[PDB]
Amino acid sequence: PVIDTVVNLAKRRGFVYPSGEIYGGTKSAWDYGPLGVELKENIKRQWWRSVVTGRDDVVGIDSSIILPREVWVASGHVDVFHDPREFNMMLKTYLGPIETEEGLHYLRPETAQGIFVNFANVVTTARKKPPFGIGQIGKSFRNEITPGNFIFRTREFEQMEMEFFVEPATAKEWHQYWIDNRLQWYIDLGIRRENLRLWEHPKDKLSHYSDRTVDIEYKFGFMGNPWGELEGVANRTDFDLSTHARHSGVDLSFYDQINDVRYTPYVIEPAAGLTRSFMAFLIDAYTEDKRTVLRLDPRLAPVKAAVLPLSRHADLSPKARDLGAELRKCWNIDFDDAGAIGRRYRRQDEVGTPFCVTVDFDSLQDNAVTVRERDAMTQDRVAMSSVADYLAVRLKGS
Amino acid sequence: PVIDTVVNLAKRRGFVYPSGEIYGGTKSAWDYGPLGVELKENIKRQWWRSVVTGRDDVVGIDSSIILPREVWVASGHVDVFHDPREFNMMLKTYLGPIETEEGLHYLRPETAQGIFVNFANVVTTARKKPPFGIGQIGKSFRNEITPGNFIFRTREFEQMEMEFFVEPATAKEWHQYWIDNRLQWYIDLGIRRENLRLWEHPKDKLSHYSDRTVDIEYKFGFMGNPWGELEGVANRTDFDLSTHARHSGVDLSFYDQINDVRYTPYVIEPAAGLTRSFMAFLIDAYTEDKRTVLRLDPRLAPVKAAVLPLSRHADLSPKARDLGAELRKCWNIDFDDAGAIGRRYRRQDEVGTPFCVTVDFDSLQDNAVTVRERDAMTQDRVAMSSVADYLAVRLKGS
Ligand SMILES: Nc1ncnc2c1ncn2[C@@H]1O[C@H](COP(=O)(O)O)[C@@H](O)[C@H]1O
Ligand SMILES: Nc1ncnc2c1ncn2[C@@H]1O[C@H](COP(=O)(O)O)[C@@H](O)[C@H]1O
Numbered sequence: 001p002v003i004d005t006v007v008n009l010a011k012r013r014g015f016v017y018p019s020g021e022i023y024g025g026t027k028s029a030w031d032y033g034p035l036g037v038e039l040k041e042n043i044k045r046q047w048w049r050s051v052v053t054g055r056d057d058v059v060g061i062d063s064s065i066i067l068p069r070e071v072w073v074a075s076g077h078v079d080v081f082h083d084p085r086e087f088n089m090m091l092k093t094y095l096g097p098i099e100t101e102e103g104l105h106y107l108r109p110e111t112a113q114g115i116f117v118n119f120a121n122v123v124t125t126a127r128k129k130p131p132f133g134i135g136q137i138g139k140s141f142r143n144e145i146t147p148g149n150f151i152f153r154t155r156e157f158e159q160m161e162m163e164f165f166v167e168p169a170t171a172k173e174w175h176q177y178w179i180d181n182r183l184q185w186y187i188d189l190g191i192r193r194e195n196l197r198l199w200e201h202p203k204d205k206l207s208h209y210s211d212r213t214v215d216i217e218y219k220f221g222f223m224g225n226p227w228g229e230l231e232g233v234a235n236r237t238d239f240d241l242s243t244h245a246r247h248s249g250v251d252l253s254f255y256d257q258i259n260d261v262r263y264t265p266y267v268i269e270p271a272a273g274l275t276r277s278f279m280a281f282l283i284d285a286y287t288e289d290k291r292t293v294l295r296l297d298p299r300l301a302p303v304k305a306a307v308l309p310l311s312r313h314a315d316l317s318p319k320a321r322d323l324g325a326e327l328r329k330c331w332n333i334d335f336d337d338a339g340a341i342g343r344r345y346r347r348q349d350e351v352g353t354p355f356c357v358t359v360d361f362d363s364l365q366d367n368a369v370t371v372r373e374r375d376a377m378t379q380d381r382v383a384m385s386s387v388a389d390y391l392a393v394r395l396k397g398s
Numbered sequence: 399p400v401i402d403t404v405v406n407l408a409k410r411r412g413f414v415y416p417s418g419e420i421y422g423g424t425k426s427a428w429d430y431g432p433l434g435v436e437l438k439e440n441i442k443r444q445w446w447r448s449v450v451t452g453r454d455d456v457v458g459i460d461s462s463i464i465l466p467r468e469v470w471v472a473s474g475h476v477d478v479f480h481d482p483r484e485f486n487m488m489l490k491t492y493l494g495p496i497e498t499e500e501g502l503h504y505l506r507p508e509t510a511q512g513i514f515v516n517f518a519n520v521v522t523t524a525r526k527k528p529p530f531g532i533g534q535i536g537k538s539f540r541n542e543i544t545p546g547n548f549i550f551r552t553r554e555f556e557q558m559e560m561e562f563f564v565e566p567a568t569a570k571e572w573h574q575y576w577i578d579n580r581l582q583w584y585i586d587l588g589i590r591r592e593n594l595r596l597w598e599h600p601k602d603k604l605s606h607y608s609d610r611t612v613d614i615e616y617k618f619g620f621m622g623n624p625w626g627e628l629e630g631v632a633n634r635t636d637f638d639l640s641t642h643a644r645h646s647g648v649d650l651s652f653y654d655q656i657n658d659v660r661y662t663p664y665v666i667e668p669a670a671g672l673t674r675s676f677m678a679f680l681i682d683a684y685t686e687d688k689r690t691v692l693r694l695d696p697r698l699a700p701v702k703a704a705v706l707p708l709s710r711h712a713d714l715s716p717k718a719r720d721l722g723a724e725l726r727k728c729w730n731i732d733f734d735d736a737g738a739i740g741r742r743y744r745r746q747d748e749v750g751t752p753f754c755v756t757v758d759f760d761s762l763q764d765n766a767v768t769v770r771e772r773d774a775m776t777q778d779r780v781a782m783s784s785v786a787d788y789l790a791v792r793l794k795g796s
């Protein structure tokens with residue numbers, strides 16, 4: 001089972017820790033350790049660049065976890081978000097002094113509703129016109145009945161969701177665009193294409209408001225069926241703005257000044273999972289070749305380079321430490337002088353570090369270092385003054 | 399009142415929106431709009447670089463909002479975190495099927511406890527030895543009795559907290575180091591030093607476990623007393639690891655292999671507020687000189703450059719759009735061709751954009767553009783092929 005092996009590596013090296021481990025934990029709750037917080041941040045950076053700020057037609061928001069309760073009546077979650085005896089899967093809390101119906105709030109089960117209710121605000125302040133999107137990354141909460149499979153299905157998780165508002169007659173081509181774009185995003189960041197597939201929902205598996213839904217599925221390797229949903233890309237017609245306009249009383253239609261027409265945009269929704277993606281990138285990268293290597297895209301790898309003096313000899317520290325401080329101004333780096341150099345390469349390979357930089361006794365005469373590439377183990381001798389440039393060309397886009 | 403004027407600008411331009419505005423909102427709940435999410439991200443980036451990954455002695459974590467309940471008994475929050483009739487300020491929720499004492503959990507009122515309970519995990523996986531720190535950014539929740547003053551004191555907020563673990567005999571010099579370093583961080587990012595001060599807590603205002611606490615205070619401009627706490631920097635002695643070791647039964651002391659000694663580290667804690675800092679940076683940057691200019695540090699400004707064709711003429715779009723696409727690969731940028739150019743400069747000044755790049759009819763012959771600097775309004779004519787380099791030298795560290 002690749003999955004358990006990857007989970008064990010993730011714990012051993014501090015990608016993750018069980019939350020509250022010393023108190024026995026809480027079911028499905030995982031903390032991100034020193035390497036995990038950096039990998040998670042890198043995934044966020046790549047999504048935000050590809051979907052939001054790298055585009056001229058998508059803007060971002062960060063809306064609150066706790067919204068007014070009526071948001072979740074309008075969205076239908078109060079009446080429908082239940083799994084059987086029906087049990088509602090939203091987490092409740094109480095705000096203010098007394099516990100009353102007025103104080104009752106839900107923690108959001110998805111980030112998307114905070115986008116929809118801000119549609120008119122964003123049109124106004126960002127001066128946007130369909131086709132355009134609003135993207136968001138954040139925490140969501142669900143009282144999952146059977147959480148587990150590591151971080152695949154947890155009660156507290158993070159999503160990366162974008163709502164793309166379009167003229168209704170253009171929705172089918174924009175849906176296809178976003179299906180194609182989102183699938184390719186995973187492949188471009190290194191997931192092997194044979195471990196990804198698309199699942200076109202049959203008509204009898206569509207929501208009442210979706211004209212089409214396609215899931216990107218990843219071959220996680222679960223027992224039984226090894227595939228799982230990674231990201232859902234839905235054509236949500238005009239249901240979301242319509243329902244919030246009806247329940248709130250605020251017009252959420254769009255006025256097209258050029259063609260003087262008013263309409264309610266259709267929505268194409270790429271709904272991805274930050275913590276679920278983290279799991280897929282780790283599993284897919286895990287390789288046993290003997291070598292254990294985490295073949296992470298260099299833009300995702302948590303540590304970009306490790307500075308490794310050949311030994312603890314005092315003559316090598318000045319250079320090695322000076323080099324580490326220079327590189328640390330640019331990237332997250334590691335410094336390690338403990339034990340045999342070959343074992344130190346293997347320690348970095350195991351967590352995906354794309355380059356190791358070795359300072360040896362020849363470095364004291366030629367003022368150069370050896371740079372080792374993780375996967376092929378090529379070793380180039382590089383002038384000290386050129387190491388950062390050498391790394392930068394190979395880490396571009398991080 | 400500068401504060402109301404800044405809040406109004408923040409709403410009008412989409413730094414913030416009231417959460418769930420169309421449903422009447424919830425007290426103290428603010429969403430971050432297109433400009434606000436970028437400013438908030440930039441503040442996070444600068445803190446994480448200065449306190450965590452730019453250092454060789456601090457690592458990061460991202461622990462769960464919902465931890466095992468016993469964490470908050472051990473920390474003393476269940477018995478002490480109450481304001482009078484006593485009222486506990488932690489937000490509660492229930493996990494799993496039935497609402498039972500076993501299902502009751504608290505949303506974290508601070509991020510620091512998730513750091514302490516992972517001390518031994520981080521020592522193990524990151525191979526750290528005091529003096530070293532663990533930093534974290536994340537959401538915290540408090541049932542504030544009188545929330546308000548915009549985003550200064552809200553029920554849902556974000557903190558930037560680091561716990562610096564030291565040999566006990568070194569705590570006083572490390573405390574002073576971190577006081578000095580954290581104060582200077584705000585000044586380096588552009589807050590005017592006359593609007594910052596330190597408040598040394600008198601002995602009768604210290605917690606039972608703090609040997610010394612110093613607050614960084616900012617002159618927000620509140621009615622009555624215009625100063626407010628911005629960040630607290632406390633020497634927390636050995637209370638935090640000791641209490642968790644006692645309640646959990648897990649030894650959280652540190653073993654020093656070199657000197658073969660075992661001890662419980664003292665803790666120096668810089669506890670900052672991401673959303674409170676956001677407010678201070680905006681207020682301090684707001685300037686009326688007539689001009690309204692948000693004098694934000696270019697590393698914090700949400701939009702780094704705006705590409706502005708002199709007019710909507712079709713001959714200027716090809717170049718202006720090509721230039722925008724080139725710059726967008728590097729930074730968040732804006733493109734605006736609506737209305738008089740001078741009003742468009744002022745629109746960018748109002749949100750802090752450090753540079754405007756104007757494409758005019760002379761650009762079609764000399765293949766150069768004018769770059770305007772926000773504060774002084776200097777205008778340099780810059781070759782198209784050099785614009786990104788020109789901006790990069792001025793945006794270094796973003
Ligand atoms: N309980 C969960 N734990 C982790 N990720 C989730 C969970 N539920 C949904 N996701 C992620 O969020 C995406 C959108 O979910 P949904 O809102 O159910 O369409 C999914 O494709 C997953 O990547
Ligand atoms: N209710 C709140 N809303 C926003 N920021 C807060 C709130 N409470 C505390 N903070 C921030 O968190 C820092 C540490 O808070 P404390 O945990 O109370 O020491 C403070 O200096 C503020 O910057």
Ligand SMILES: [Ca+2]
Nearest residue numbers: 026027028029
């Ligand atoms: Ca678990």
Ligand SMILES: [Ca+2]
Nearest residue numbers: 424425426427
């Ligand atoms: Ca409010």
Ligand SMILES: [Mg+2]
Nearest residue numbers: 110111112271
């Ligand atoms: Mg959804």
Ligand SMILES: [Mg+2]
Nearest residue numbers: 215229231232
């Ligand atoms: Mg689905």
Ligand SMILES: [Mg+2]
Nearest residue numbers: 508509510669
């Ligand atoms: Mg605290």
Ligand SMILES: [Mg+2]
Nearest residue numbers: 613627629630
């Ligand atoms: Mg305080």
